[PDB]
Design an enzyme around this catalytic site. Sequence first.
Site, PDB file in Angstrom:
ATOM      1  N   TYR A   1      15.054  -2.206   6.654  1.00  0.00           N
ATOM      2  CA  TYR A   1      14.394  -2.773   5.478  1.00  0.00           C
ATOM      3  C   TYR A   1      14.017  -4.209   5.863  1.00  0.00           C
ATOM      4  O   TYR A   1      12.846  -4.521   6.044  1.00  0.00           O
ATOM      5  CB  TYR A   1      15.329  -2.749   4.265  1.00  0.00           C
ATOM      6  CG  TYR A   1      14.704  -3.196   2.951  1.00  0.00           C
ATOM      7  CD1 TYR A   1      13.846  -2.356   2.237  1.00  0.00           C
ATOM      8  CD2 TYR A   1      15.002  -4.442   2.403  1.00  0.00           C
ATOM      9  CE1 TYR A   1      13.309  -2.753   1.007  1.00  0.00           C
ATOM     10  CE2 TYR A   1      14.474  -4.845   1.183  1.00  0.00           C
ATOM     11  CZ  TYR A   1      13.631  -3.998   0.490  1.00  0.00           C
ATOM     12  OH  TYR A   1      13.140  -4.393  -0.731  1.00  0.00           O
TER      13      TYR A   1
ATOM     14  N   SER B   1       9.137   0.599   1.106  1.00  0.00           N
ATOM     15  CA  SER B   1       8.713  -0.638   0.448  1.00  0.00           C
ATOM     16  C   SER B   1       8.605  -1.758   1.489  1.00  0.00           C
ATOM     17  O   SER B   1       7.717  -1.708   2.347  1.00  0.00           O
ATOM     18  CB  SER B   1       9.672  -1.004  -0.682  1.00  0.00           C
ATOM     19  OG  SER B   1       9.112  -1.995  -1.518  1.00  0.00           O
TER      20      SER B   1
ATOM     21  N   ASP C   1       3.377   4.562  -8.770  1.00  0.00           N
ATOM     22  CA  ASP C   1       4.174   3.523  -8.122  1.00  0.00           C
ATOM     23  C   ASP C   1       3.555   2.193  -8.482  1.00  0.00           C
ATOM     24  O   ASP C   1       2.701   1.674  -7.770  1.00  0.00           O
ATOM     25  CB  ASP C   1       4.226   3.685  -6.603  1.00  0.00           C
ATOM     26  CG  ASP C   1       5.195   2.699  -5.938  1.00  0.00           C
ATOM     27  OD1 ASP C   1       5.632   1.727  -6.581  1.00  0.00           O
ATOM     28  OD2 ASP C   1       5.544   2.913  -4.771  1.00  0.00           O
TER      29      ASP C   1
ATOM     30  N   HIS D   1       7.837   4.394  -7.537  1.00  0.00           N
ATOM     31  CA  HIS D   1       8.463   3.753  -6.385  1.00  0.00           C
ATOM     32  C   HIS D   1       9.651   4.512  -5.794  1.00  0.00           C
ATOM     33  O   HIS D   1       9.874   4.454  -4.594  1.00  0.00           O
ATOM     34  CB  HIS D   1       8.859   2.317  -6.727  1.00  0.00           C
ATOM     35  CG  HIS D   1       9.080   1.446  -5.528  1.00  0.00           C
ATOM     36  ND1 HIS D   1       8.102   1.222  -4.579  1.00  0.00           N
ATOM     37  CD2 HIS D   1      10.161   0.735  -5.125  1.00  0.00           C
ATOM     38  CE1 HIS D   1       8.575   0.411  -3.646  1.00  0.00           C
ATOM     39  NE2 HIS D   1       9.823   0.104  -3.955  1.00  0.00           N
TER      40      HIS D   1
HETATM   41  C1  LIG Z   1       9.946  -3.021  -2.060  1.00  0.00           C
HETATM   42  O1  LIG Z   1      10.590  -3.723  -0.993  1.00  0.00           O
HETATM   43  C2  LIG Z   1       9.082  -3.992  -2.908  1.00  0.00           C
HETATM   44  C3  LIG Z   1       8.000  -4.676  -2.075  1.00  0.00           C
HETATM   45  C4  LIG Z   1       8.649  -5.904  -1.577  1.00  0.00           C
HETATM   46  C5  LIG Z   1       9.612  -6.346  -2.640  1.00  0.00           C
HETATM   47  N1  LIG Z   1       9.874  -5.113  -3.405  1.00  0.00           N
HETATM   48  C6  LIG Z   1      10.667  -5.025  -4.489  1.00  0.00           C
HETATM   49  O2  LIG Z   1      10.763  -3.982  -5.156  1.00  0.00           O
HETATM   50  C7  LIG Z   1      11.444  -6.285  -4.880  1.00  0.00           C
HETATM   51  C8  LIG Z   1      12.732  -6.408  -4.075  1.00  0.00           C
HETATM   52  C9  LIG Z   1      13.646  -5.489  -4.814  1.00  0.00           C
HETATM   53  C10 LIG Z   1      13.370  -5.825  -6.268  1.00  0.00           C
HETATM   54  N2  LIG Z   1      11.943  -6.204  -6.251  1.00  0.00           N
HETATM   55  C11 LIG Z   1      11.199  -6.504  -7.320  1.00  0.00           C
HETATM   56  O3  LIG Z   1      10.020  -6.860  -7.214  1.00  0.00           O
HETATM   57  O4  LIG Z   1      11.802  -6.404  -8.486  1.00  0.00           O
HETATM   58  C12 LIG Z   1      11.007  -6.740  -9.606  1.00  0.00           C
HETATM   59  C13 LIG Z   1      11.435  -8.087 -10.114  1.00  0.00           C
HETATM   60  C14 LIG Z   1      12.386  -8.192 -11.122  1.00  0.00           C
HETATM   61  C15 LIG Z   1      12.797  -9.432 -11.584  1.00  0.00           C
HETATM   62  C16 LIG Z   1      12.252 -10.592 -11.039  1.00  0.00           C
HETATM   63  C17 LIG Z   1      11.297 -10.499 -10.031  1.00  0.00           C
HETATM   64  C18 LIG Z   1      10.895  -9.251  -9.576  1.00  0.00           C
END
Ligand SMILES: *C(=O)[C@@H]1CCCN1C(=O)[C@@H]1CCCN1C(=O)OCc1ccccc1
Length: 710
Positions: free
Chosen positions: A473, A554, A641, A680
Site C-alpha cells: 500500500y 487504492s 467507487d 471502493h
Molecule cells: C485509497 O488509498 C484512497 C486513495 C488515496 C487515499 N485513499 C483513501 O481512501 C484515504 C486514505 C484512507 C481514508 N481515505 C479517505 O480519503 O478517507 C476520506 C476522508 C475522511 C475524513 C477526512 C478526510 C478524508
Amino acid sequence: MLSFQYPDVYRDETAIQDYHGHKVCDPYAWLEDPDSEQTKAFVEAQNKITVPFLEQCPIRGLYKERMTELYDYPKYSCHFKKGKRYFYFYNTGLQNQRVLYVQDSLEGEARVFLDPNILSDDGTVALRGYAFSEDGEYFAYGLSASGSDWVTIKFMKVDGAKELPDVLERVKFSCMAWTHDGKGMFYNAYPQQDGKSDGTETSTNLHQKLYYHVLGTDQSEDILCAEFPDEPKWMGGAELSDDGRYVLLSIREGCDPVNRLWYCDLQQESNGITGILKWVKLIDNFEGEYDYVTNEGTVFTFKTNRHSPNYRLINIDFTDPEESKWKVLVPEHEKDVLEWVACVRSNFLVLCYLHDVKNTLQLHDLATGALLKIFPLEVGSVVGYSGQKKDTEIFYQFTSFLSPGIIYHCDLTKEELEPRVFREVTVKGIDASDYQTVQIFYPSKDGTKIPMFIVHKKGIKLDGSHPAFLYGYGGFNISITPNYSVSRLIFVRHMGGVLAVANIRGGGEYGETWHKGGILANKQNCFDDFQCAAEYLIKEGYTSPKRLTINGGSNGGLLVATCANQRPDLFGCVIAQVGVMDMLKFHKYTIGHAWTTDYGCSDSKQHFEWLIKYSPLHNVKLPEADDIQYPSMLLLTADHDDRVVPLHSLKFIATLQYIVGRSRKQNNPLLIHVDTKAGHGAGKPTAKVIEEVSDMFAFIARCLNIDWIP
Ligand SMILES: *C(=O)[C@@H]1CCCN1C(=O)[C@@H]1CCCN1C(=O)OCc1ccccc1
C-alpha cells in the site's frame, strides 16, 4: 492468448493543459464523464473482452468453488455491551452481509437485531457507521447503497427493535454521537449539490457541516452547530466526553494524523443546543493529533503525536491548558507505535502497540500511566475490541496470516485478571501447520531496512520456481499488519504460491517518520521500496520475475501501476484495484482533495514536478529493450467507487492499450473490469467478494500458466 482486439477509443488530441509551462495532453479526458454515452460504450466494450478472457480457463471455476467452501466459516465480531444488553456481529458463513445480534444476557439467547441482507436481493445495501445512545436504548445506523460513501442514517428503539421514522440524508464522512441526555445525535452532512449524489458522480465534496438531530423531528429542523465557510475542506467531527459534559470537536483538513480540538462545555450553554455552540478553541492549529481517550473532571487524556512520532498519552487540564503544563502520562516509546488507547472500568487504560508490525496489548492504570498487565498474544494483529469507561470487561479479536481469528474476553472486576478464549473458529481445509510466516528486513535503494512478511509452505526449495503474490500500500500512515485471507491461502495451497507483504514507507509501521518517509517529495521512496522487495524475493530464490504478481488497492493501486511503468521487467502480472492513476487531477473529484497531504497538488509548480515523474497515467512508455514488454495487467474498479472515481482506471487502461497494447512485442494482456453496484470496497457483499478474488487468481493462473493443485 490475445484472441481479441482492444476497443477503438477516440483520442482528443486537442486536450492539452498547461502546468506551469509543462504542457500535457490528456486525450482521454472525456472518460472523466461517467454519464456520457461515449464512456458507457467504452466501459461496455472493455468488459466485453475482459469477461470471456477471465472465464475461459476452468481454473476460475475451481478457485471459485474452493473459495466458496473455505470462506464458508463462522465470522463473529467482539461482543459489546450497550445499556443492559450485549451486541455482536455474526455471519454464519456465506451471508452477503454480517448481521447484528442482541442478547439481554451474556448467557442469554441471542436474536437478530438488524439484518442488512433483507434490504436488497444482492446484498448491496450495507451498514456504514452506527452509534447507540448513552443508555443503549436507542440506535442510529448508516446505510450505503452499492458501495457508495454516501449514507442515509436511520433510527431504531432497541427494545423490540422498533423502526423509527427519523431519516437523515446527505450524510458522508460523518460522526455519530448522541448527547447523554438522549435528546438527539450529532452528525455530518454536505450541502445540496446539482447532479447525482449516489456514488456515480465525480463532484467534489466541500463545506461539510456539523448538525444535531433531535429524535422525533424532521431533518429540516436540525440545528447547525458548527461550520467553516472560509475553509471548504475542513471537516468537524463531534463526540461526547465519557461524562457527557463536553462535546469535543476534531477538525481535519487532509489525511495527515492531525486535528484541531475545540470543546464545548454543555453546562455553559444558555439553553441547550440551539445553534452555533460556544466553542473554546483549545488546540487551534493542525500541528498535531489529539485523540480523546477519557477525562476526569477537567483533566483530559489524549493520545498524541505532538513531537512524538510513535505517539504517547498526555493529560491536558482545561483549567491550565498551556502546553508547558501538560502532563506526560505514558511517554513515547523509542520505536514501538502506540496504535490506539481505550479507557475501561473507570481507571484502566488498554494500550495497543505495534512492535515490528505485530500487535501487543497492555493494561495500564489511568492515574499513573503504569503498566499493570500484558495480555498474551501470538504473532498477528488485534482487529477488534470492546470496553468503554463504564464497562467492567473487555473483548478483543486477534487474527494472523494463518489463523482465522480468536476472540478473547477478560472480566476486569476480578482481583486477579484471567483472560480467556471466548470464541474460536478454525478453517477445516487450510492446515496452518503446513505453512510458516517469516519476517525479514531488506535494504531499500537508500539503505533503509524495510520489513516484509513472507508466507509459504514449509520445506520449499528456494530455487525461484514458485509463483509469488507481493502486496503493498505504502501511504496515509496505514500499517499493513497480519490478517487472515482465505483467498491468498488458496493461492498458496492450490496454486503453490508464496505470499509476501512489504511494509514500505508511507505507512504507519514506524510512526510518523515512516509516514513522512513516503509522501510528497519522497513518494518515490514507496516505489523504490516495493521494487526492492520484488528484487529480494527474486534474489533469495522465492520466485522469478515471470512468476511474480504484484497487487495493491487504492493508494496501493497507484503503487503497483507505477511499478509497472518503472520496472516492467520485474513483474509477470500486476493487478491494480481501485487505484489513483491520474496524479495531476486526483484532487478535483469527490474526496480527492484530502489526499494532497500525502501526494501534494499539481496546482503547485513544485508539487507538479514530483507528481509528473511517477503519475501512472503520464508514464506509460514502451520499454526500450526489444526483449522487454509490459507485464500482464488487470485493473479492477466499479461504477459506484466515489472514493477513487473510476475515471482513473478508465483513462489509464485506454492509455496502456493504445501506447503499449498496439506494439508487436506486447503479447501480455492489459484489461479492465468495471463492476456494477459496487464501490471502493467497504460493505461489498460476500457474493461479489468471491467473484472478485476468483477473477484475480484466474487472471494470474491464465497469464503465468499455473496448474491448479487439487
Ligand atoms: C485509497 O488509498 C484512497 C486513495 C488515496 C487515499 N485513499 C483513501 O481512501 C484515504 C486514505 C484512507 C481514508 N481515505 C479517505 O480519503 O478517507 C476520506 C476522508 C475522511 C475524513 C477526512 C478526510 C478524508
